[PDB]
Design a protein around this nucleic acid. Structure first.
Ligand SMILES: [Mn+2]
Ligand SMILES: [Mn+2]
Ligand SMILES: [Mn+2]
Length: 425
DNA sequence: ATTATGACGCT
């Protein structure tokens, strides 16, 4: 009882830009704002592949990883913005730069861990403590939480419900106890309101957020109320939330491991996990997964918010599907050069912005008819930021995959170059 | 013929 630690030591937030690429294009092109619109890559094959969808377009059924011609069938007024094309491939520079704008604002409040181009985690523990002392006993007004939902409330129109739940939460709050996890989460959500207001003020981009005691709960919370809303998931709300939460909705259980949790244990929802001992879980899923599952189904996870705002690897990738697969030597060389030229541009920009050089080049290929997504991955040294040298080395390192007797066989359906192992400059 | 990435575990 008194010695069962409840994983309530931390305040952790997950901030996620709503349909991020679409917002970047909507800021640039006002004629897209407040409309069904999506962002695509390429346009010849079925109108191109959609990778981001505005909420108005989502209400028609338009989803990511859908062909544009198909989405137009669901949403005939759909508007489309196209990813930039450079050297024959998609170039995502506009979005990496918008992402960095957002990250630099978030970093003014706390230390953040960039988790993807559009989302980061925040460790607010110190910030909440500082603020809690700044109030010196003053209660938290609902006015300070204008977009916050309290998960599990009310109990016993949408904005009316939100306000009722916030009112129940605040009325039941003990503002005098500077050590109550619920008060701490609450101050964290106030700071997250301020972070999101600064982001919208200074970039125009809207975002959702989750506020909880760890990364998995913060991430799960962020998704409960989108777009443009933030959700507080308290420790106390976990048993009811998890009691109907499909296992697959938890971060890292959406694929094969979650499928086998479901199949092996004979269960559907996160909460059923609590009925197993740690040893049973470890026996089925290994010692690490076992401990992690045993704590997670009770709302507890210790994965830290890493202080890492910049990517650890810088990569360039192009698929060559169907009949576009690269079948000759000249083709493989030209596309390796195009990839290495974009990689060189991004790496030089990186070294100048962030004072660091990569030291290792990773070359990855898929061959046609190969089941795997990486038919080969081989590393070599990266000593100078020169696109010709890097493409020549990537060739030197992949060339023994050709089984021709000028030709290339099996034809290549993917090239990939990744600069890694960064060291300060 | 979702594609372009990027983190992280396993051995
Ligand atoms: Mn997002
Ligand atoms: Mn998405
Ligand atoms: Mn995201």
């Amino acid at each position: 009882g008194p010695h069962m630690a409840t994983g309530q030591d931390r305040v952790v937030a997950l901030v996620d830009m709503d349909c991020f690429f679409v917002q970047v294009e909507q800021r640039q092109n006002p004629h897209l704002r407040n409309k069904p619109c999506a962002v695509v890559q390429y346009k010849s094959w079925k109108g191109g592949g959609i990778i981001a969808v505005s909420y108005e377009a989502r209400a028609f059924g338009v989803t990511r990883s859908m062909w544009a011609d198909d989405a137009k069938k669901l949403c005939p007024d759909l508007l489309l913005a196209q990813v930039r094309e450079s050297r024959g491939k998609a170039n995502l520079t506009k979005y990496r730069e918008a992402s960095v704008e957002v990250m630099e604002i978030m970093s003014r409040f706390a230390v953040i861990e960039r988790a993807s181009i559009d989302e980061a985690y925040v460790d607010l523990t110190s910030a909440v403590q500082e603020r809690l002392q700044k109030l010196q006993g003053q209660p938290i007004s609902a006015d300070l939480l204008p977009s916050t939902y309290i998960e599990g409330l009310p109990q016993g129109q949408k904005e009316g419900m939100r306000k009722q739940g916030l009112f129940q939460w605040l009325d039941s709050l003990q503002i005098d106890n500077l050590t109550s996890p619920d008060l701490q989460l609450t101050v964290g959500a106030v700071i997250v309101e301020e972070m999101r207001a600064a982001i919208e003020r200074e970039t125009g981009f809207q975002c959702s957020a989750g506020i909880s005691h760890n990364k998995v709960l913060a991430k799960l919370a962020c998704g409960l109320n989108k777009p443009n809303r933030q959700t507080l998931v308290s420790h106390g709300s976990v048993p009811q939330l998890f009691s109907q939460m499909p296992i697959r909705k938890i971060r890292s259980l959406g694929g094969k491991l979650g499928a086998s949790v479901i199949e092996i244990l004979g269960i559907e929802y996160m909460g059923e996990l609590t009925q197993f001992t740690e040893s049973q879980l470890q026996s089925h899923f290994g010692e690490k997964n076992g401990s992690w599952l045993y704590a997670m189904c009770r709302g507890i996870e210790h994965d830290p918010v890493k202080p890492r705002q910049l990517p650890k690897t810088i990569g360039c990738s192009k698929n060559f599907p169907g009949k576009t697969a690269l079948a000759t030597r000249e083709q493989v060389q030209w596309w390796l050069l195009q990839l290495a030229q974009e990689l060189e541009e991004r790496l030089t920009k990186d070294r100048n912005d962030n004072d660091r050089v990569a030291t290792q080049l990773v070359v990855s290929i898929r061959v046609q008819g190969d089941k795997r997504l990486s038919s080969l991955r081989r590393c070599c040294a990266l000593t100078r930021y020169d696109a010709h040298k890097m493409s020549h080395d990537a060739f030197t390192v992949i060339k023994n995959c050709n089984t021709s007797g000028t030709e290339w066989s099996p034809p290549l359906t993917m090239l990939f170059l990744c600069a890694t192992k960064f060291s300060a400059s």
